[PDB]
């Protein structure tokens, strides 16, 4: 028949007709946690009669199994089951225009390339290392002092207890 | 009579009426780390006298055997055993984890 | 042939010669988060015919596996593959100054703050999902001990009510 | 690497997309050439500032 | 559609219609060494969506 994608309570629900059962099923997906591989695995472990399933971009190329569900539902695609090909059209979202998206993409890319070339990971690790070293240095000036502080505290409690017993 | 769902100490529990043993059997199940499939398996293992079992959406389309139970307890549903169909209405619950699709407000607050 | 250690993007890349295919291979070492054991595992994982690996100090002693790379790349050493020995001599990069680094730390922390801003909502969402999945398992694991706790606390409270009434 | 030396499986992806490379699938060598920013070390003090403008 | 049983080379070939791909499939049965259980296993092994099979 047909395959639909409807948003319910903010979550996508894909209604698809399976070949073997001849009964329409529906799958609720999380756009952040799940991926294309998870959806295809859920669709395969449903009726067991589907030996080959894939998801193609409308240009003909195939999307990988690690592509997130959110990144997939931006535009149409083609769900290919063993020898059927269904054209899926998710409902369009209202987001930034085709001009501001380019600016945000440029910002993200520049920030990421600056994070890589400047080697900020080693900078953070060096900061944490300096902090650990300072903390462990503060405890080496305390080893001699506490050894006499304990003596003083002991011979003070030894008089306090004697006062109590007296 | 009918089927009820209650959250106790953060865990959902569902009281099912079973055909072969007419006794209100309770199932304490985790909403995140389980699916509908394992719930149907628990039902079949408990009764072992039920021919089949299935869950349906409030409209009539069958819900998959892999959706998490947290994704299910949002809205109402139907539980059909081989001869009876109980309309199960979960308790009113608004949000689960604040994880859903993207929104222009998210991009605005990011900027 | 030879083993060369050079510096790119602030990270040391070391180029060794693998035996099974007679080709070179470069490993990017992280001078803070990596150790000698990590380097050896990465070296014998990119090639399965390296069952014997070792790293010796130039005087003869064997370097321990729990040694930091920044501590190792100071002096020369000897790398040992199945039956060959390579005399590795690291370079000595230059500390820039006290002034240029003082103005570089500003950029290195601003880029860190920007990168944190760009990728903290998705990370906190994954964190909250993991925390819910972990709490639901901790409570399930605690469920059986509560029964024993209550059976103990009833016997521990009966005798203290007996003490008060006595 | 474009010189012919292999790249270990522990190399980060962000360190790889900073320079073109080769990809061997079975026996075909595809010369991958990613779009890299042609700016240099000092340009960061501008590049960072550049980011500000976009924001 | 339909299920046809014919004879070729002295062996009966039976052509059924499988549900998962909507195509026919012919099974060559051996009238002495095979049984009904063998035919049913071969029928639900060439197609995984045949969880229910019977012969009356």
From Swiss-Prot, chain D:
What post-translational modification does the entry describe? Phosphorylation by CaMK2 in heart leads to increased MCU current. The regulation of MCU by CaMK2 is however subject to discussion: another group was unable to reproduce these results. Phosphorylated on tyrosines by PTK2B/PYK2, promoting oligomerization.
Q: Where in the cell is it found?
A: Mitochondrion inner membrane
Gene induction: MCU transcripts are down-regulated by microRNA miR-25. Down-regulation by miR-25 may protect cardiomyocytes against oxidative damage in cardiomyocytes.
UniProt function note: Channel-forming and calcium-conducting subunit of the mitochondrial inner membrane calcium uniporter complex (uniplex), which mediates calcium uptake into the mitochondrial matrix. MCU channel activity is regulated by the calcium-sensor subunits of the uniplex MICU1 and MICU2 (or MICU3). Mitochondrial calcium homeostasis plays key roles in cellular physiology and regulates ATP production, cytoplasmic calcium signals and activation of cell death pathways. Involved in buffering the amplitude of systolic calcium rises in cardiomyocytes.
Family statement drawn from the similarity comment of this UniProt entry: Belongs to the MCU (TC 1.A.77) family.
Entry remark concerning the domains of this protein? The selectivity filter, in which calcium ions are arranged in single file, is composed of two acidic rings separated by one helical turn along the central axis of the channel pore. The N-terminal MCU domain is required for efficient Ca(2+) uptake and for interaction with MCUR1. It is not required for targeting to the mitochondria, oligomerization, interaction with MICU1 and MICU2, or assembly of the uniplex complex.
Subunit structure, briefly?
Homotetramer. Component of the uniplex complex, composed of MCU, EMRE/SMDT1, MICU1 and MICU2 (or MICU3) in a 4:4:1:1 stoichiometry. Interacts with CCDC109B/MCUB; this inhibits channel activity. Interacts with MCUR1. Interactions with MICU1 and MCUR1 are mutually exclusive. Interacts with SLC25A23.
What is the name listed in the Swiss-Prot or TrEMBL entry for this protein?
Calcium uniporter protein, mitochondrial
